Chain A
C-alpha cells in the first residue's frame, strides 16, 4: 500500500483538533524495506506512562472493479 498512500495524519486524543495535529516526518530506517514516518510527541513519554494517538490514512485506487466490465443493467 505504501505506493498508494495519499495522506497520513496523526493527532492526540483531544478537542484542539486544529492544534493537536502532531508533526510527522517521512523517515528511512536502516536496512528495512518500506516507507516509515517519525512522529514527534508533544511531551515525552516516561517509563510506565501512556498516551492515546489516532492515526488517519487514505489509500487510492485500492478498490478494483471485479468484474472489470458490465452492461448498463449490471451492478458494480
Chain B
C-alpha cells in the first residue's frame, strides 16, 4: 500500500529532460509509479476534471516556463496540495515567475531570476569557472533519516537557485542548508544591496509537511537530479581536498523521492479504547478521582505493509483547557496504554495524543470524556468520628418513647 496512488504527472520544459534524467525516472518507474510526460506548455494539461483529481503525484521539472498550459495554475496547484497530493518542484537560474508564486504560497521564497547560489570555498573543481557548482557538505544534511535515508552519503553536488524559508511558517523543513560561506546573488553584478540569503540561511532543498499531511519538496537545482551529477566524481577545488569516486546525489534523490511519495514515515492511528480499570467497557461518565485505563494502537507503513509502530516517546495528555496530566504511554501487549487516576476536578475533559516528530506523519487523536462529581449515594457513611451524633438521635428517640409510655400511664 502506497499511501498515495501511483498516478504521477511529469511536467517537462523540454522533452530532452526525459533522456537526460533517464536514471531517475527508471529508479521511479521501478517502484511501480505510472508516469506520464507532458510539456508544461501543453494546452491539454489539467489536474481536476469534474471535481476529481486525475493524478496523485505531480513533478514540476519545468523551471523556465512563464505559464502553465490548460487550467493548471498556482491556485490549482494550491488546491491540489490542499487535496492531499504530493508535489515535487525543481528550480534553476531560469526560474520563471509562477514557480516563485508557488513558493510564496508554500512559504519558500526563491531568489530572483538569473541569481545563483555562490560559494567561493566549496565550488567543485569541475565548475565552469563561476564558483556556482557547490559541493554541499553532508554536515548540513538534516538530521532526519526518514527524509534523507539512514545510510551515509558522500558529498552532493548542487547548482541552482537559493531559497529562504520564511521564519513566520513553523512547518517548513530545512532539509539542506548552504554552507556558512555560501550566498545567493547576481554573480556578475556587485553587492550593492544586502543578499537575499547569506550563510547557513541559504537553503538548497526545503520541504513542507501540510496539516493535511501533504508533502512538498522544492529543490533549487534540476541538474541535481541529472544523470551527469549521478555519475560525476566530486572533489573540492581548494587544495587538500579528497577525491570521492562517486557523489551521494543518487541515494539522496531516491530517499527524497521515497519521502515525498509517502513511502516512509507514514503513520496511522487505529482504535482507541478507555475504560474504568477492571471493567471491559467505557461508562457514560467517569467520577472524580476514578481510575481509568487508556489504550491506543499506532501502525507504521513498512515496505508498503502496515506494522505495529516502534516509537518509544509517545505522550498522552488529559486536557480541560490547559493539560492536567501528561505521561508517557507504555508499549504493552502490542498497544500503547497507561493507567492513571483522574484529577480532582469535574468537567468535559479530552484525551489527546499528539505524536509530532520530524519527518513522521503528524498524528492527532482526541476523545471527549465528561468527568462528573460524586453521586449522593457514594458519599462516606457511618463515619466513626460521628458515632456520638448517631447515638444522640438514637438516644432521643428512646427517651421520647419511654416518656410517651410513662406520661400517659402515671
Q: Chain A interface (Cβ within 8 Å of chain B)?
A: 66-69
B388 adjacent to chain A (CB < 8 Å) = no
A66 to B51, CA, bound (A): 8
Sample (7) of A-B pairs whose CB atoms are under 8 Å apart: A66-B50, A66-B51, A67-B50, A67-B51, A67-B52, A68-B51, A69-B51
The residues of A that contact B51 with a CB separation of less than 8 Å are 66-69
Q: A76 to chain B: closest CB distance in Å?
A: 12
Which residues B45-88 have CB closer than 8 A to chain A?
A: 50-52
Q: B223 to chain A: closest CB distance in Å?
A: 41
The residues of A that contact B50 with a CB separation of less than 8 Å are 66-67
A68 to B51, CA, bound (A): 8
A67 to B53, CA, bound (A): 11
Which residues B21-63 have CB closer than 8 A to chain A?
A: 50-52
The residues of B that contact A68 with a CB separation of less than 8 Å are 51
Q: Chain B interface (Cβ within 8 Å of chain A)?
A: 50-52
A69 to B52, CA, bound (A): 10
User: Which residue of the partner chain A has the closest CB to B51?
Assistant: A67
The residues of B that contact A69 with a CB separation of less than 8 Å are 51
User: Which residue of the partner chain B has the closest CB to A66?
Assistant: B50
A68 to B50, CA, bound (A): 9
**SS class of chain B's interface: helix, strand, loop or mixed?**
loop
A66 to B52, CA, bound (A): 9
Q: Which 7 A-B pairs have the closest CB atoms?
A: A67-B51, A67-B50, A66-B50, A69-B51, A68-B51, A67-B52, A66-B51
User: Which residue of the partner chain B has the closest CB to A69?
Assistant: B51
Q: A23 to chain B: closest CB distance in Å?
A: 45
The residues of A that contact B52 with a CB separation of less than 8 Å are 67
User: Which residue of the partner chain A has the closest CB to B52?
Assistant: A67
A52 to B51, CA, bound (A): 46
Q: B309 to chain A: closest CB distance in Å?
A: 34
The residues of B that contact A67 with a CB separation of less than 8 Å are 50-52
User: Which residue of the partner chain B has the closest CB to A70?
Assistant: B51
User: Which residue of the partner chain A has the closest CB to B48?
Assistant: A67
Q: A63 to chain B: closest CB distance in Å?
A: 15
Q: B83 to chain A: closest CB distance in Å?
A: 12
A66 to B48, CA, bound (A): 13
A7 to B50, CA, bound (A): 32
Q: B84 to chain A: closest CB distance in Å?
A: 16
User: Which residue of the partner chain A has the closest CB to B50?
Assistant: A67
A68 to B52, CA, bound (A): 9
User: Which residue of the partner chain A has the closest CB to B49?
Assistant: A67
The residues of B that contact A66 with a CB separation of less than 8 Å are 50-51
A69 to B48, CA, bound (A): 13
Q: A17 to chain B: closest CB distance in Å?
A: 42
Q: B150 to chain A: closest CB distance in Å?
A: 42
Q: A16 to chain B: closest CB distance in Å?
A: 48
User: Which residue of the partner chain B has the closest CB to A74?
Assistant: B51
Q: B295 to chain A: closest CB distance in Å?
A: 36
Q: A73 to chain B: closest CB distance in Å?
A: 15
Q: A66 to chain B: closest CB distance in Å?
A: 6
A53 to B166, CA, bound (A): 75
Q: A69 to chain B: closest CB distance in Å?
A: 6
A69 to B50, CA, bound (A): 9
A28 to B334, CA, bound (A): 51
A38 to B51, CA, bound (A): 44
A67 to B48, CA, bound (A): 11
A18 to B1, CA, bound (A): 60
Q: A40 to chain B: closest CB distance in Å?
A: 46
A51 to B347, CA, bound (A): 77
Q: B386 to chain A: closest CB distance in Å?
A: 67
Q: B71 to chain A: closest CB distance in Å?
A: 15
